[model samples]
Target: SPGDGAGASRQRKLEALIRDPRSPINVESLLDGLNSLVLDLDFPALRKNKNIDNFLNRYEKIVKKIRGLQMKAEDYDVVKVIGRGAFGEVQLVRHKASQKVYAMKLLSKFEMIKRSDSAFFWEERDIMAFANSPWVVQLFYAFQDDRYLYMVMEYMPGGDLVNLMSNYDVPEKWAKFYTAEVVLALDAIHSMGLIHRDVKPDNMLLDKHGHLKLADFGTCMKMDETGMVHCDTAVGTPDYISPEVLKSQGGDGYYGRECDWWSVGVFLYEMLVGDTPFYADSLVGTYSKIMDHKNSLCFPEDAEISKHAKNLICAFLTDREVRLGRNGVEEIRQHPFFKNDQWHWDNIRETAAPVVPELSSDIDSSNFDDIEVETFPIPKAFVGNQLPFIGFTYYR
Candidate 1:
């Protein structure tokens, strides 16, 4: 009984359970380990794999380290409301222990359940944790309580694109830099089999150094195992809505990642043209313009912009089949718009930003909007006795 190999697999299972922070202590595997080692049977072999003792020992240490991670709202000193999210509001908060600043997205559990959009809540969490690209916002911690869900993220002090655009029209050179960075980020995301459904200025932000970081995964969609995803419902802002998305709203067709590329086209056009080509008085008017773009895709005679930019926009705004980059991003990269421009695929991340913020210190949030903070009273009693969200904490 002591010489059997049963403990080998049991020790491996225990190893996996400890490594995964979300996984509970595997009591059965632990029991199996003990049973196999009842007479010191598998002790020598278990020590040979991945330093199992250190891993198991660190599990208790980690649990103690993060014991206070599931904190109450009172634990953070809410500075101001930075912006609103899909299910709740984002606040600039300062953590008491580390004295570090973070953007805390507070989502109402009751509101999420009431809107019949519970699946999106999980999707946002899973996507944010899965995405580790340099051009995307990083998720530091996520936890939930009886009333609200909290996502603590790195604060982007330089503000967002919408705010920056309002201050002044961005030059063509800066626009190109931002667009190229966004395209690179999108390629990384698409490689992971996901689509950023909402690709508007409001969802794109600038870190303190002013580099683009795509945010807001509340509307992201994951592709199936076969590298294909489709949706009938319309997503994203009206100005950036692709024809396929509009058609989907009319119950005419299904669309996929191509819709996101179309949005990028509209955004590029807006960046240079100062407005969308399809803007109109009403929703019906806007839809009519996009469907009949041959007559409506008119560039202002006075709006000074290069013809190459126009051609790129037109390529992205075309039908999904003949669109530029329809096959892949490499095709888009070779277009005339990026002519004579060398893309240092490996060194772009370390490049200096086109615009840098005047941050005073690590916790300097002066660049953020000085908006009013909202107050929602927590309830004294609840109908349910358990926490509304279960299994909702992330590390690193």
Candidate 2:
């Protein structure tokens, strides 16, 4: 009984010390590296007891923490190419230890810095590091080699919304479900003072369970001191830029989260009708009409979708002033489209997805397109120059 009491008191002290950020001796010390500690001083009976099991479990957690810290590019076996981007390639990788599948984005530092605006790479990494929502794809680990930065993320086998929408005209109910999730995601991102500049079908990914996970934060921006993102650079796909973005491109100056809501409206329209409402011959025609504002917006007359749904689109596409969340996300949720439908906003994950892709296993990359990997030797001295980042590290 005395031994059990002493064990309980020691565990409490260790936990409290770990909880204190300023404590000189903290739990991190036990998990920092592979320096192993053993427990043989106690009696074998005490070591074999249930209380000892709890102690060992905490020790096991510390071991896992070390494994996460010991992350390296070599820890993942390159399975196949899953995606290609301007600066780098995304590969379907199998973890050597867990054999779990993950999407690893390998960005070449030389390629990234060529664009002058290299803040994007770090911004994307930082945003994912900041993310704590199920509606977003999870970043598991991040490390860098001399030539490239590696971002390891949970693989979403259901593919992007572009692939999903390509199969058929999405039902209004499905559109409603997806849009509701996107709203919450946008709400979450904006609350962190970050804005996803590119909100298109291609960037919207789904898990195997068919829930939405907003991906691609390269073009995302954090709010400046003025409480608005001065997004004058005009990034993102031509099909989805918001009215404010168009205005910014036309030299009208700053933009903010209102732009993302407009993109959501574009996204919703495409989901229901199978194409963007503003689709045109060229970028010139598309953005000209987007900036026109008064003229470019339209709803399908023959569409089987309800007027309430169309009304939501019109509300978002037009009137940056009278937009859905002029007040808060509750305003968007209160829109008639979501009214009386009895959709549970907080627990969308509990709902059966409208379309779930059948995957072979956790390591399956069948959902992603096969692209050829570009071969280049990783530089020996490829470590990233540290940015002005705070609280950015690999954990969890």
Candidate 3:
């Protein structure tokens, strides 16, 4: 009993669910997790009755309320506060009618207007533009009701990448492939001129099959041809912010895009090697340490990392001229470490001891009942195609 491969076996079940959507999810792990928790959950009598639009509408109402209470401890009859960040927050909320759970972000228009000289209204648009990216988190719709605005998004079962670190150190191969996916997504986001200033492990989500779904748009901002990032402010976790951010620098006058690239590098470094490249447990220590620059680096000898992986990271993390066109990220993707990347993402059946959390029993499809989800009339472009919401008009 002590040596049973429970972790490995459960992972395989999850992989099957992910790779082949038709494959039934194995509920053993969830049942086991539920048994371990202190939740006074009662399964709440779920019913799959509402249309997708109805689900979206209902989620917005709840999210809207929490938006005003961001860091002040929001009080909703919440199913689960699955995710959190410095500003704004996401929760798996329940609707009343055809009981369902929707992942929704609560944003305070006043707080946003106060922080970024630029507004998050553009972020709502940027994310919606690529709403269908398989690797990106899906957004159902957004709505505002007096106090706050709610961005109803997809609920990813597995937790954030930070949780993944607790299991096994991410393989270098997976790091390369996964980084490429984010870069592709970054390219897409940047095309619309948006910079995800915070690109750390905390913003990423894992799917049932061990694939990735990028989440968290709180620190995301719009960039124009002028290439300004956080033009009016510098914000994000201290360790993950770019060199400019550390210097209280302005993306070296290139805007926050440079800082985003640096954070990406730090994130990449931490994934394969198991810890932040520039981290210190304390803020002053981290700042003084990184200011010295060389003090901010580490690569575990135990990591099965290749030379190319290290080189690409050096380019990303260093103060060198912010190189991020094809030569920077593309070459990393083309590196030998990712020899079978396409195979990796496509092969859902081959489970690798989950680098992230298992499907949480905390929330699921039928957690909501009362709200309505209606379609936005704005035509949407997702994954590369323009499509209307499943049944609603793109424009109002």
Candidate 4:
């Protein structure tokens, strides 16, 4: 069954379940393929043959492999950065080795903590646990220590969807491509009962070949109405946050799963049209627009956007009943946009991408994160005034 079509999809679903249960059997199988496919390439200076080096070294290779995987797609290399935030900065990555481009996110521990740890960290652990879907960033490996946790994930060379929208409302074909991929990923994620709370353009990265990779799980969480989710601390980017989450209105912290679609609706607007229907720079403005059901936002005058895209976005934006879990990746996937194109239902999706744009294939991102531990500063000794304040406290 592992080789059959149904067997492969079943493996993916079960792995998602295993991410929560912590059974090594499921994990070992997942790891078996990845670690083997990726040879044990080493990083410079970050290793000294012992201690944290092994963990960092192993994970660093995973980071490199993610780029390696993308080479199958694009011919251009990514080179510029689109934006940075508290959780992490998104780098405009390039590909030289494979002729593709991608946008890779570099996350720091402090940044993850600044966001709600329960949702962000554990969500990643859950998503990465059983996740090997192509539409999602492939979680290569996670290495941790006393001070840091580093996770290596896939890179999308097409730049972020938001940057693409800065030009104009995307054409319908492109919107359908992105929406369809996300829905495909959601089918896998939801089958495991996971909720991708944060589904913004900032989180979706694309490559030159038009394939979408969902990046960043900092706002993601495992949803359960019966169990308490560890935190109700307000989270999510303002313009894109669902009202249910914003108001804390649901029976359980705003019906966690339902609120996801709300964000999806908002995201569709960004995809079909270039900008958010409701955007205000200040917190108050954003809050008022989201909560007050503001629908005055604009779209292209002669745009080729579809009716389903428009109506679905409208439902996603204002309807509370619909926002409270009425729709999700399944509901949207079957939408008219994907008519006759059912090839990407699961693993048959694009494995290779276009040549990366502007990126140097010779470059590796993990190389940028290398820390000079030897040169790093630390206090050798304290209290210089034990016996001789002036003389180094030496007994002579």
Instruction: For each candidate, give its TM-score against the true structure.
Output: 0.79, 0.76, 0.62, 0.60
The total number of steric clashes, by the backbone 3 Å criterion, in model 1 comes to: 0
Please write out the lDDT profile of model 3 over residues 87-109, one tens digit for every residue.
45567776544455667676654
Runs off by more than 4 Å, candidate 2: 1-70, 250-252, 340-342, 373-395
30-52 in candidate 4: lDDT tens per residue? 44334322222133432444653
Q: Tell me, by lDDT, which candidate is best.
A: 2
Give the per-residue Cα lDDT of candidate 3 at 303. Answer: 72
CA lDDT of every candidate? 0.70, 0.72, 0.55, 0.54
Candidate 3 structure, TM-score to reference: 0.62
The order by descending TM-score is 1, 2, 3, 4
List residue ranges in candidate 1 displaced over 4 A: 1-18, 21-69, 234-236, 340-343, 373-388
* Residue 212 CA displacement from its true place in model 2, Å: 0.9
Cα deviation at 243, candidate 1, in Å, is 1.7
Give the per-residue lDDT digits (tens) of candidate 1, residues 1-396. Answer: 477676898888778886765453433223323322221221345445555555545554544344344455777888779787557889989988878898999888667666555556656676566677787788887865545778888899988877777777877777777778878888877887887766888878888778888878777778777555556654544777777667776664655677788888888888887887899989788888888876788778888878888888888988877877778899877777765343455565577776788887766766566655333233332222122244555555
Q: For candidate 2, what's the RMSD?
A: 11.3
lDDT, model 1, position 149: 76
